From a paper:
The key determinant of host specificity is the envelope-located trimeric spike (S) glycoprotein, which can be further cleaved by host proteases into an N-terminal S1 subunit and a membrane-bound C-terminal S2 region. In the S1 subunit, the receptor binding domain (RBD, also called the C terminal domain, CTD) is localized in the C-terminal region, spanning ∼200 amino acids, and structural studies have revealed that the RBD consists of two subdomains: the core and external subdomains. For both MERS-CoV and SARS-CoV S proteins, the S2 subunit is mainly composed of α-helices and forms the stem region of the S protein. Here we present high-resolution structures of the trimeric MERS-CoV and SARS-CoV S proteins in its pre-fusion conformation by single particle cryo-electron microscopy (cryo-EM).
To date, little is known about the structural and functional information of NTDs for the MERS-CoV or SARS-CoV S proteins, though its counterparts from other CoVs, such as mouse hepatitis virus (MHV) and bovine coronavirus (BCoV), act as receptor binding domains and their crystal structures have already been delineated. We also solved the crystal structure of the NTD at a resolution of 2.2 Å. Our crystal and cryo-EM structures show that MERS-CoV and SARS-CoV NTDs fold into galectin-like structures as in BCoV, MHV and HKU1CoV. By contrast, the NTD domain is observed with strong and clear density, forming a stable triangular platform on the top of the S trimer. The flexible RBD regions are located on the triangular edges between the NTD domains. Since the RBD is located between the NTD domains, a strategy to develop neutralizing antibodies, which target the NTD and interfering with receptor binding through steric hindrance should be feasible in the future.
Author numbering: 18 to 240, 244 to 289
Amino acid sequence: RCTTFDDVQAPNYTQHTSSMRGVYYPDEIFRSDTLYLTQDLFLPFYSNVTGFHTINHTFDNPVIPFKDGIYFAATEKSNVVRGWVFGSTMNNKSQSVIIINNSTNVVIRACNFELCDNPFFAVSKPMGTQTHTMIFDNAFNCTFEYISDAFSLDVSEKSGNFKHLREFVFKNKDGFLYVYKGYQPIDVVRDLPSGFNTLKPIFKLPLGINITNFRAILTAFSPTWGTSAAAYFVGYLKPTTFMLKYDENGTITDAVDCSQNPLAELKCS
Ligand SMILES: *[C@@H]1O[C@H](CO)[C@@H](O[C@@H]2O[C@H](CO)[C@@H](O)[C@H](O)[C@H]2NC(C)=O)[C@H](O)[C@H]1NC(C)=O
Ligand SMILES: *[C@@H]1O[C@H](CO)[C@@H](O)[C@H](O)[C@H]1NC(C)=O
């Protein structure tokens, strides 16, 4: 059973900056102590980024075009952003893959899903426990199934600053859904803080599905819906030439966006 919310305020599509975020290890090669020039799908430095903010009567989960791949950040203190649906029609007329953390397991399922237009987890604000999981009402022709080892995640509403910055890069390449991940702690009340955090590949999903759109799977907090403060950010990957500095320990510690300006475009420098 799918549930829509009553009086949702429309999204504002606020604009923010990506600073120097979104850099990821572009492949599996273990380069070390070198500079590496490549042309790949990168998020250019100081690109515009769309901020979807959940607060008060606002609950931003619209269908967002996937295009050539995305950078996706989330500023969190109450584990609101819990997953994504990647697909095309977002109907059960086509294949979709759901990638979620449902508070005990990480689930990745590629099926013909009867998606809820307003998919959400629901948590009791007084009881502090997850009560509902309403993402789809039916599923058939399931093509991919992954369920992680069990864990225990704090689902309850928290107060104060956003303490967790969770970054991801999603690409559809060679029939695979590449999922890159990075994390860093923060303490901020708004916006996507400036910084640099290389993302590492965590999934290379052999789905082979058409992914033109996606939707964020969020968390409503009820005491009959309600919200808790959160925000995610979508940037679009573009074909760009980057120079990645692989340190002596094999770590990407710095990068130059060669299209940023002629000073950067010193071949590059
Ligand atoms: C998160 O999803 C997992 C996977 O569907 C759930 O684990 C399964 O739960 C069902 C009953 O709900 C059991 O029959 C299965 O044996 C479980 N599978 C595994 C691998 O443990 C889990 O219960 C879900 N968590 C929440 C909080 O809904
Ligand atoms: C999903 O497919 C079933 C039949 O397979 C159909 O009854 C249902 O209406 C579809 N979903 C939606 C949202 O229409």
